[PDB]
Amino acid sequence: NDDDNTEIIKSFKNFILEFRLDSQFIYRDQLRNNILVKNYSLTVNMEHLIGYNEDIYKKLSDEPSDIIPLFETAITQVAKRISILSRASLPTFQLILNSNANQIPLRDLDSEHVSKIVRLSGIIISTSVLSSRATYLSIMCRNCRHTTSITINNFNVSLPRSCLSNCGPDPYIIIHESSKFIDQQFLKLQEIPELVPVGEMPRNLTMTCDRYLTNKVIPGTRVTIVGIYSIYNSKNGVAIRTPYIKILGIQSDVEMFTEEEEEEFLQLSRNPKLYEILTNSIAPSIFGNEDIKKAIVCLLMGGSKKILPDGMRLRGDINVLLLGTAKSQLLKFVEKVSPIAVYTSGKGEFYLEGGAMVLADGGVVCIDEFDKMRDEDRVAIHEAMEQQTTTVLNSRT
Amino acid sequence: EELTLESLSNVKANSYSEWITQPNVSRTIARELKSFLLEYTDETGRSVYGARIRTLGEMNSESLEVNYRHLAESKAILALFLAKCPEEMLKIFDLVAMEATELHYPDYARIHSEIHVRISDFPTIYSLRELRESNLSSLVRVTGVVTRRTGVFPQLKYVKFNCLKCGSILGPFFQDSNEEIRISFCTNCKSKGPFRVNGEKTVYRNYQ
Amino acid sequence: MYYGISQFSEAYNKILRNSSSHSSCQLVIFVSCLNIDALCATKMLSLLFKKQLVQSQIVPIFGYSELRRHYSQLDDNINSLLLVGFGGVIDLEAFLEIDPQEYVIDTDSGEQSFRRDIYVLDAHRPWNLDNIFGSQIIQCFDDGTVDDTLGEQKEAYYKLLELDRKQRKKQIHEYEGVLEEYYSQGTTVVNSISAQIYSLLSAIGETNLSNLWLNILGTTSLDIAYAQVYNRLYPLLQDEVKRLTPSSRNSVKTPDTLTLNIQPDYYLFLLRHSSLYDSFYYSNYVNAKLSLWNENGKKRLHKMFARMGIPLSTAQETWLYMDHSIKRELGIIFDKNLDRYGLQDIIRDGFVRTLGYRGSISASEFVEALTALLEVGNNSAQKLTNLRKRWVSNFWLSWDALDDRKVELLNRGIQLAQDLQRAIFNTGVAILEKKLIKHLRIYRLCVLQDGPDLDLYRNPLTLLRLGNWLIECCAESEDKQLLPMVLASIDENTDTYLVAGLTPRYPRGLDTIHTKKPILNNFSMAFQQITAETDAKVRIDNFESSIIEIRREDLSPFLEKLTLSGLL
Ligand SMILES: [Zn+2]
Numbered sequence A: 001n002d003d004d005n006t007e008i009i010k011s012f013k014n015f016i017l018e019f020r021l022d023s024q025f026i027y028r029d030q031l032r033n034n035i036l037v038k039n040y041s042l043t044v045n046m047e048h049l050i051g052y053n054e055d056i057y058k059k060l061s062d063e064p065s066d067i068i069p070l071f072e073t074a075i076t077q078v079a080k081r082i083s084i085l086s087r088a089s090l091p092t093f094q095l096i097l098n099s100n101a102n103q104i105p106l107r108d109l110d111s112e113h114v115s116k117i118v119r120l121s122g123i124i125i126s127t128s129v130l131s132s133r134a135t136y137l138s139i140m141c142r143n144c145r146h147t148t149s150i151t152i153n154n155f156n157v158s159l160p161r162s163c164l165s166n167c168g169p170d171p172y173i174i175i176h177e178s179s180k181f182i183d184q185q186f187l188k189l190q191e192i193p194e195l196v197p198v199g200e201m202p203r204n205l206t207m208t209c210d211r212y213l214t215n216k217v218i219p220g221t222r223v224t225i226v227g228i229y230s231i232y233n234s235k236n237g238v239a240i241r242t243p244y245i246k247i248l249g250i251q252s253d254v255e256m257f258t259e260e261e262e263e264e265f266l267q268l269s270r271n272p273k274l275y276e277i278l279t280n281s282i283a284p285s286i287f288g289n290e291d292i293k294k295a296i297v298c299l300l301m302g303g304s305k306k307i308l309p310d311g312m313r314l315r316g317d318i319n320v321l322l323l324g325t326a327k328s329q330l331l332k333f334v335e336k337v338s339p340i341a342v343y344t345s346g347k348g349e350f351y352l353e354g355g356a357m358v359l360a361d362g363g364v365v366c367i368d369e370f371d372k373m374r375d376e377d378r379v380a381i382h383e384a385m386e387q388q389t390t391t392v393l394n395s396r397t
Numbered sequence B: 001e002e003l004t005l006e007s008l009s010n011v012k013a014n015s016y017s018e019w020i021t022q023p024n025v026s027r028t029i030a031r032e033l034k035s036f037l038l039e040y041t042d043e044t045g046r047s048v049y050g051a052r053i054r055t056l057g058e059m060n061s062e063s064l065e066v067n068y069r070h071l072a073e074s075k076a077i078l079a080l081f082l083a084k085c086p087e088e089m090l091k092i093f094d095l096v097a098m099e100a101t102e103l104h105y106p107d108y109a110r111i112h113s114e115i116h117v118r119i120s121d122f123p124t125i126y127s128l129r130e131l132r133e134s135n136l137s138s139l140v141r142v143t144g145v146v147t148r149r150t151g152v153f154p155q156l157k158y159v160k161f162n163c164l165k166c167g168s169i170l171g172p173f174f175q176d177s178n179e180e181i182r183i184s185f186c187t188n189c190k191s192k193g194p195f196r197v198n199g200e201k202t203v204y205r206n207y208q
Numbered sequence C: 001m002y003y004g005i006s007q008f009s010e011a012y013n014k015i016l017r018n019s020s021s022h023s024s025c026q027l028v029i030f031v032s033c034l035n036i037d038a039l040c041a042t043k044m045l046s047l048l049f050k051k052q053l054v055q056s057q058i059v060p061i062f063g064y065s066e067l068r069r070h071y072s073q074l075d076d077n078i079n080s081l082l083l084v085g086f087g088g089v090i091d092l093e094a095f096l097e098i099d100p101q102e103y104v105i106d107t108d109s110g111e112q113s114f115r116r117d118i119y120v121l122d123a124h125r126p127w128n129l130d131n132i133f134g135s136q137i138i139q140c141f142d143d144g145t146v147d148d149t150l151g152e153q154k155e156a157y158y159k160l161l162e163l164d165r166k167q168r169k170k171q172i173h174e175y176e177g178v179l180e181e182y183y184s185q186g187t188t189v190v191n192s193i194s195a196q197i198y199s200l201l202s203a204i205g206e207t208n209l210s211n212l213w214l215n216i217l218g219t220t221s222l223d224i225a226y227a228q229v230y231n232r233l234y235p236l237l238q239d240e241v242k243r244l245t246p247s248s249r250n251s252v253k254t255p256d257t258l259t260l261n262i263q264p265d266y267y268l269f270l271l272r273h274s275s276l277y278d279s280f281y282y283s284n285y286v287n288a289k290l291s292l293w294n295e296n297g298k299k300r301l302h303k304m305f306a307r308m309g310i311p312l313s314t315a316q317e318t319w320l321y322m323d324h325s326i327k328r329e330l331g332i333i334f335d336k337n338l339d340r341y342g343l344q345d346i347i348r349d350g351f352v353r354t355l356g357y358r359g360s361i362s363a364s365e366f367v368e369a370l371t372a373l374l375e376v377g378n379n380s381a382q383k384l385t386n387l388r389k390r391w392v393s394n395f396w397l398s399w400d401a402l403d404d405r406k407v408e409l410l411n412r413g414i415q416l417a418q419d420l421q422r423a424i425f426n427t428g429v430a431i432l433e434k435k436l437i438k439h440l441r442i443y444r445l446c447v448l449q450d451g452p453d454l455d456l457y458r459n460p461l462t463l464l465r466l467g468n469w470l471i472e473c474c475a476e477s478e479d480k481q482l483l484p485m486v487l488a489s490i491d492e493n494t495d496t497y498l499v500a501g502l503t504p505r506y507p508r509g510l511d512t513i514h515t516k517k518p519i520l521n522n523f524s525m526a527f528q529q530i531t532a533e534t535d536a537k538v539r540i541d542n543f544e545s546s547i548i549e550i551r552r553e554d555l556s557p558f559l560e561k562l563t564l565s566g567l568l
């Protein structure tokens, strides 16, 4: 057996060290660079692997859970060979995949896809916090004091019960100090709103990522994911097991000024009627209201906030009042063009913070009708704007 | 030796199922079921079940529609037997479906390794309150409004296991969908022990 | 006759002797765009000259009038003109109004010479006898058709030219009738221009795998329309493939390893680059056989896939991602039940290029992608000029695509082909449901006025694709006799119908006593006669005379004359 695993490892090593297009060992160079930036991880295109030899790709598809670790081991060996002179250490490398094949709608996923490399997409609803996963362990035997260790993978083990040089039922124990661990996040994904069937709740599903795939996205972000449809025996129905997905790879659907930008702004300044051009440009659909356009420009531009040596600060955020839907469209346009804005006409795991207005900072905060807005009474806005303010409102908008 | 359908009429068994589980009895039941499927036809003479199989393959549906009256029309003995002991004859008729589908669609197992028989027009009907222990262990046609639905989670259709003591592999027992396996014994070493599930060999069915 | 096959090398040597000078380029190659085989031929010639290091210029052209104006702007320095896939039937000397005396130089002595040389590779068939015989400045690389079929035509032409009275009538009328009989016959491409150029290279010994691949592509493109020509040429291309095939067999696949091997090229659409289900769903032959256009055809398609025992889900998966078992046993799968469904004709062995690990491609798929790129690569007179400029840009885009390095462009062309094919299929099914096809008893007229896809159909090749699909479905429909097919497409910007006259065709697989006969296309002659008789504005400028334009209001009167025409 182990011979066949070694053969697969050798095949993957050959793929990495040999797969060449035109005149570039794309994967060799990519690995070398990723090492050069200490990013011990490789990304592989499925199509490329198939092109090199269909057999390896098919074997991977058959038993991803075991094939993948072998491929990562091959990556590690290649990295050692290309980055450290032989006869003259590196961590296990993360392997990243990109099938780019036909997707499977979240709802469609079922028993058929179990243990199969799945390819799909959605919008991430939430992101957990990273946790420890023990890649390597340091293990002491409780009574005979026999040293040992375990190298665990994040696929498909438990502390051995036997002495291995009666000593006890589980004489082994963990030495956290010598042991080594990695990061592991947990993400939850909902089907695309469009993908949701007629008048049906959007389905949701949970994942886990680790190594460099950690912290690659944030909640409320459309994304396409590749992973193995996986099932785990949740402690929380007879023979019912909780289904999840192991994230093989991620692609972002949605995914500072350079010389050109500053040049353009300088030229804009060169224009004498630049201010007039602006005023003409704000909400062109809202004809007239010239003073309104001027005030919009001023508010968008804010002011020279100054802090005196004594400490007392000079506010720079201007606040403008307007008095049907014409103003609604105006504020909508303002928020659209505003670098940051908060539009709301007054309608507005153990943690509580301030109201919506509190979260607003910088940018702008718009309200269609104060005469309609009375939530939290005016005094909250009074303070939040006059003073720009445990319960302190450290905002400036 | 196999038995005649009239011979099947003589249950001559401790229980209806006891009669069905009889090997030659099972052979006779399967033969009669296949005969019905291929032969029973609408008044038009077209094999309604033939067209049903055609569509089943075409749509790749894994469930075969079946009308109870049709069997009541012909081979009604089997209708009564199924009513008494639905599970056994359901299994047998599902295998009959295997055979009926494959002949018209050879190698359909690729598309669906299995099929599911869907009886329809079951004459007897009871309300939830009408239900009685007498009704238990038998098919019942009932109506209502679904109150709450759970998400479709996978369930272990077939399960092997691994005795912690030795437990290289344990039989791929079929999970009943209502209780756990609890073999509480090991063939490799005759005793109890932690029988770790064999992830290598296991079939998963959608559950809800 | 003028330049027979045997003397292609001699003509090429003459071209060198005339225009070979590193000092300046005296060779100009006029090429009629919107023709795959023409593009392949031009690329082959370009490579040849690159080997010979003779500076030259490439001139894409779309219409006869464009060719006329381009010749008007020509410079005397140029002495060699290469016309690719255009001008064979027209009297170029007359059309370009070339006076022999204007160009005559160094005539001497029983000899003649001129300052310029017009070489024609337009292998349609109805060769302009004046070009063949009357003209000398005109040079036509004939495939021997003249010396094998037009010998009586040559005799009649030379007799009529000789005539310069009962006997006079008794001879002149017969010769005129002979010439007219050689005329009044519809056009039908005789042979691949790419094939002729490949033969010339063989004469020059320049043959290499790349040239053979180009010739294969040109012939494969020609196949769809003139399947008989492709059948005739296929053995020769296979022979050349074996001839250039390397000795090494089953050599370990390496990035540098490049092969051009013959193996089953199933008559489907983008099989390697589209799901089996999709390939079947858009294979013109498949839809024609199963009438997939109707929903019952889709039902039968599902039934057929079930018969295959292939999970439909799998059939819709990306071809590159098929399971190895199916990806390899598909041969047996097709061997079984294809006849049961009557689709056995789909099985076809064909050339399939491949390179390194990047993947493989069938000549059919490659030419399909090339056509897609040619079509969607990107004041009324200005609008037409801009449209033809887009077409020329697509021509050059395809030229670039020919290079292997630009695999990205080929992939883009593949996606464009998929999109265009699906759009064509949707339009065709809508048409058939609409029953827009009208049995006029002289043709099955089907005029198009619906908005969607009309913009695309302004391209002659797009209209040709739609009409080809329609003709496939009709010919497979035994009820329909081989009536001439007429297609028109109004352009709102120009308010003109893109009239296209599409010849019928016997079922692809059909190869009985009939089908052997070539159904010539009289659409062009009928259109020209009606246009001369009438005055409805039209555009015969397009090199493919079968395709012409007409005002939105000039259409129906022109159609009325067309059904009135007895020429069809
Ligand atoms: Zn110990």
Ligand SMILES: [Zn+2]
Pocket (backbone or CB within 6 Å): B163, B164, B165, B166, B167, B186, B187, B188, B189, B190, B191, B193
């Ligand atoms: Zn045991």
